[PDB]
Design a protein around this nucleic acid. Structure first.
Length: 55
DNA sequence: GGCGGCCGCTCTAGAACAGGATGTATATATCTGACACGTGCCTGGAGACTAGGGAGTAATCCCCTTGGCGGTTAAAACGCGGGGGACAG
């Protein structure tokens, strides 16, 4: 058990990658969910959130 | 001596302009009520591991869309007549 580092900090992001991945897994959406799919989804949500909050 | 033309005078009205009216834009005074910080957890994701399976890639194949023609008659396009309707009033 090494140091617990979240995937959001490794990707330079604030939205939770793990919570997005868990909601994709338990959302009965697909049999498999890739590694980059929650990162891409969280990045898109972060960009949309930042743009909407800035406006 | 009578009459058309010309210019001044007064009447009338469109419109720029200033003053009153009332519902909002602000300047504090103060309430106030959620906002975010702190704390205490604790419950879900991450490091690490096991295993395997569906796609990355290579090969084939056969298939089906693109280019590329004449032909020919359906039709786009130009134009004349005109006709009923969009819109100003």
């Amino acid at each position: 058990r090494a140091k617990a580092k979240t995937r959001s900090s490794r990707a330079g992001l604030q939205f939770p990658v793990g919570r997005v991945h868990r909601l994709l897994r338990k959302g009965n959406y697909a049999e498999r969910v890739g590694a980059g799919a929650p990162v891409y989804l969280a990045a898109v949500l972060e960009y949309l959130t930042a743009e909407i909050l800035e406006l």
